Write an enzyme that holds these catalytic residues in place. Structure first.
Site, mmCIF file in Angstrom:
data_model
loop_
_atom_site.group_PDB
_atom_site.id
_atom_site.type_symbol
_atom_site.label_atom_id
_atom_site.label_comp_id
_atom_site.label_asym_id
_atom_site.label_seq_id
_atom_site.Cartn_x
_atom_site.Cartn_y
_atom_site.Cartn_z
ATOM 1 N N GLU A 1 51.253 12.356 60.140
ATOM 2 C CA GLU A 1 51.451 13.646 60.789
ATOM 3 C C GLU A 1 52.384 14.515 59.929
ATOM 4 O O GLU A 1 52.214 15.735 59.872
ATOM 5 C CB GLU A 1 52.027 13.476 62.202
ATOM 6 C CG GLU A 1 51.225 12.536 63.104
ATOM 7 C CD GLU A 1 49.912 13.120 63.603
ATOM 8 O OE1 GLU A 1 49.187 13.755 62.813
ATOM 9 O OE2 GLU A 1 49.585 12.924 64.794
ATOM 10 N N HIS B 1 50.384 16.175 57.465
ATOM 11 C CA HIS B 1 49.668 17.298 58.068
ATOM 12 C C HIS B 1 50.594 18.513 58.117
ATOM 13 O O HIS B 1 50.169 19.636 57.853
ATOM 14 C CB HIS B 1 49.199 16.929 59.475
ATOM 15 C CG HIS B 1 48.262 15.761 59.506
ATOM 16 N ND1 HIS B 1 47.815 15.196 60.680
ATOM 17 C CD2 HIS B 1 47.708 15.037 58.504
ATOM 18 C CE1 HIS B 1 47.025 14.174 60.400
ATOM 19 N NE2 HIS B 1 46.943 14.057 59.087
ATOM 20 N N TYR C 1 50.047 22.242 56.372
ATOM 21 C CA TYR C 1 50.140 23.565 56.973
ATOM 22 C C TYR C 1 51.096 24.476 56.213
ATOM 23 O O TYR C 1 50.863 25.679 56.132
ATOM 24 C CB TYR C 1 50.524 23.453 58.451
ATOM 25 C CG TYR C 1 49.359 22.983 59.302
ATOM 26 C CD1 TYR C 1 48.158 23.697 59.317
ATOM 27 C CD2 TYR C 1 49.433 21.809 60.052
ATOM 28 C CE1 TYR C 1 47.058 23.254 60.053
ATOM 29 C CE2 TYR C 1 48.325 21.356 60.799
ATOM 30 C CZ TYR C 1 47.145 22.088 60.787
ATOM 31 O OH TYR C 1 46.043 21.650 61.482
ATOM 32 N N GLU D 1 46.343 14.371 71.006
ATOM 33 C CA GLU D 1 45.553 13.948 69.852
ATOM 34 C C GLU D 1 44.053 14.166 70.061
ATOM 35 O O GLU D 1 43.357 14.654 69.174
ATOM 36 C CB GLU D 1 45.765 12.450 69.569
ATOM 37 C CG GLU D 1 47.201 11.972 69.280
ATOM 38 C CD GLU D 1 47.651 12.236 67.848
ATOM 39 O OE1 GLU D 1 46.792 12.401 66.962
ATOM 40 O OE2 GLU D 1 48.869 12.266 67.601
ATOM 41 N N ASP E 1 42.110 12.123 60.124
ATOM 42 C CA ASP E 1 43.270 11.339 60.538
ATOM 43 C C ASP E 1 43.412 11.303 62.063
ATOM 44 O O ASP E 1 43.663 10.243 62.645
ATOM 45 C CB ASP E 1 44.560 11.908 59.935
ATOM 46 C CG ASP E 1 44.706 11.596 58.454
ATOM 47 O OD1 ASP E 1 43.927 10.772 57.936
ATOM 48 O OD2 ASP E 1 45.614 12.170 57.811
ATOM 49 N N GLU E 2 43.252 12.454 62.715
ATOM 50 C CA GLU E 2 43.396 12.496 64.173
ATOM 51 C C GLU E 2 42.422 11.556 64.874
ATOM 52 O O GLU E 2 42.740 11.014 65.925
ATOM 53 C CB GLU E 2 43.199 13.918 64.719
ATOM 54 C CG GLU E 2 44.129 14.973 64.136
ATOM 55 C CD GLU E 2 45.601 14.581 64.151
ATOM 56 O OE1 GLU E 2 46.031 13.770 64.998
ATOM 57 O OE2 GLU E 2 46.341 15.117 63.311
ATOM 58 N N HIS F 1 44.153 8.349 65.044
ATOM 59 C CA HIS F 1 45.274 8.427 65.967
ATOM 60 C C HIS F 1 44.837 8.330 67.427
ATOM 61 O O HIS F 1 45.487 7.662 68.233
ATOM 62 C CB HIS F 1 46.032 9.741 65.748
ATOM 63 C CG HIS F 1 46.538 9.924 64.351
ATOM 64 N ND1 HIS F 1 47.131 11.095 63.924
ATOM 65 C CD2 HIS F 1 46.565 9.080 63.290
ATOM 66 C CE1 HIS F 1 47.499 10.964 62.662
ATOM 67 N NE2 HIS F 1 47.169 9.751 62.255
HETATM 68 FE FE LIG Z 1 47.581 12.736 65.178
HETATM 69 FE FE LIG Z 2 48.185 15.627 62.624
#
Ligand SMILES: [Fe+3]
Ligand SMILES: [Fe+3]
Ligand SMILES: [Fe+3]
Ligand SMILES: [Fe+3]
Ligand SMILES: [Hg+2]
Ligand SMILES: [Hg+2]
Ligand SMILES: [Hg+2]
Ligand SMILES: [Hg+2]
Ligand SMILES: [Hg+2]
Ligand SMILES: [Hg+2]
Ligand SMILES: [Hg+2]
Ligand SMILES: [Hg+2]
Ligand SMILES: [Hg+2]
EC number: 1.17.4.1
Lengths: 340, 340
Positions: free
Chosen positions: B115, B118, B122, B204, B237-238, B241
């Protein structure tokens, strides 16, 4: 009183490293201290996959190893595994709740994450050289000698976490908890965090390096090739980790961050000193166990003690501390070939 | 109290996922639930570096965009950034102190780490599409329309964290703190955990995905393509998760991990159901603020609300909750091109 997303729009460039407003937005376009962003960048570029490293040759090497050398090798490995287990979770549990600048918050998580990769690396090595990993892993928890050398690490983190919880729950002041008087001093908590960082520094910069020396001693013999490759990768990471703690400590000491921390670093100086002296003594005492069944050419109690003193002086000088040991040249210059 | 290394030799294969003995040795040669080891492996193989993605043409695309479209894209980006900020730290701070099996402990740290990547992604995007990223980052903390879900989300985590500290510090029982009675119940703490978990699962599984549609709608029009490439990696990735939280919740409700948890989950199912619907409603309400100045090609208030209902039904059924919306087929099949 801790929050996962503080709603106060604050200037993260002006927060102190620790004990300021909890970090809300995770941004990486700017930072109070760019060294942490640089460390994140470097650590991310060092990501490696342990299981990719061929260690099949290591099983042969290990089994063919004289029993006392197997003892030396495995005992060293178990200790490294212990330290990585602690370092994989502790930075996160003990530091995250106290960090107030985004670059440091993410650096700690990146640092901690890389330690779990080191842990996975040791499972890969263990699982491939031993018949039943459970015997090794279980012994890590038991074995008074291993816990003896590591004594003081988990205890310090635990004390800091507990004091931190009290601070977040009750705030500063003198309280009454179940009829007992409990004092929550921010000043004292800062001292705890400061000394925890010094201890982590000693851990990252001394304890891991003394173990690398034992590992590479086999590599010098052209044995345990896979392990040697993994240890080289691990050492590359530990170099970044101790660079990180040395900077944290020296920045606090400078007074450019939290002014109170600079006062504390000065008042804590003797405790800092003592912490290193104790850690070094623990690493030395471990020699009696490590070489209980015999030593190796180029690796014995005397050599280990000389190296411990050699590296401790270097590490202590790096954070402004007086040197406790007589100055000496590197007793094992062959280690440089394997490091950085 | 919590410890960074429990000195008691225990069978990690027999501990519950949460509230058992704190994890001591980090080993990965065996696990109670192999799903977590598989997820760690998958997540490690998916590591990527945002900076390597070309987003130089996104700046021009953004400028040419109609004002209402700039609003849609940037508002969505800000919300995604908020969520990643929370998800980079929260799983670690909230779950690590409660986990009792090694594979889950490391999965949580790996999940949290991804995360943070991530979040870094951004920053990379924001810096390459606007002049002065500061304007964007500050708005995340203060933007009213965004700071509603943040409050609700951070609230579940914050309450769990606070109750966890009381549990570790005082243990179960009726206590007094500065003249006030403070009750600590493991049963209530387990319920609180079941709650962050359900909430994180919706975060998620639903919250992120709704933003992805918002984002890939541009990609379909060949706009903001650098952003799209990055979002594709993030979505990959999510998926992992949400797979992880789904397994956690299902193992807890089935009763195979901890009977009491199964009991607690059954009791608060109506609550979890409403918790999910509320999250879905918050995402729907956001469509308003999002399309307050107009819609765009392939995306409007109606389509989005349809997608939220579609996705919510699937996710809720996956964790044993009744379907709150009328069944329907994917309102935007084209999104499948960008999703795992
Ligand atoms: Fe996630
Ligand atoms: Fe993420
Ligand atoms: Fe390490
Ligand atoms: Fe390290
Ligand atoms: Hg420490
Ligand atoms: Hg050594
Ligand atoms: Hg001090
Ligand atoms: Hg000091
Ligand atoms: Hg010596
Ligand atoms: Hg939560
Ligand atoms: Hg959308
Ligand atoms: Hg529930
Ligand atoms: Hg729920």
């Amino acid at each position: 009183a801790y929050t996962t997303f503080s709603q106060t729009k604050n200037d993260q460039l002006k927060e102190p490293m620790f004990f300021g407003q909890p970090v809300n937005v995770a941004r990486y376009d700017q930072q109070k201290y760019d060294i942490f962003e640089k460390l994140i960048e470097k650590q991310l570029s060092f990501f490696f996959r342990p299981e990719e490293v061929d260690v099949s040759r290591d099983r042969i090497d290990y089994q063919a190893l004289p029993e006392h050398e197997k003892h030396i090798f495995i005992s060293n490995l178990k200790y490294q595994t212990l330290l990585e287990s602690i370092q994989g979770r502790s930075p996160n549990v003990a530091l995250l709740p106290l960090i107030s600048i985004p670059e440091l918050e993410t650096w700690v998580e990146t640092w901690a994450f890389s330690e779990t990769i080191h842990s996975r690396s040791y499972t890969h090595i263990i699982r491939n050289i031993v018949n039943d990993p459970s015997v090794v892993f279980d012994d890590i928890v038991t074995n008074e000698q291993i816990q003896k050398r590591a004594e003081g690490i988990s205890s310090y983190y635990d004390e800091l976490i507990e004091m931190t919880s009290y601070w977040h729950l009750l705030g500063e002041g003198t309280h009454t908890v179940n009829g007992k008087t409990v004092t929550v001093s921010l000043r004292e908590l800062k001292k705890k965090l400061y000394l925890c960082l010094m201890s982590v520094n000693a851990l990252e910069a001394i304890r891991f390096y003394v173990s690398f020396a034992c590992s590479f001693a086999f590599a010098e013999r052209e044995l345990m090739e896979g392990n040697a490759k993994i240890i080289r990768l691990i050492a590359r990471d530990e170099a970044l980790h101790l660079t990180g703690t040395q900077h944290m400590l020296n920045l606090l000491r400078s007074g450019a961050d939290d002014p109170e921390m600079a006062e504390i670093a000065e008042e804590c100086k003797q405790e800092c000193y003592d912490l290193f002296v104790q850690a070094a003594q623990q690493e030395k005492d471990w020699a009696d166990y490590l070489f209980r069944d015999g030593s190796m050419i180029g690796l014995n109690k005397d050599i280990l003690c000389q190296y411990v003193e050699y590296i401790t002086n270097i590490r202590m000088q790096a954070v402004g501390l007086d040197l406790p040991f007589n100055t000496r040249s590197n007793p094992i210059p062959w280690i440089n070939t394997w490091l950085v």
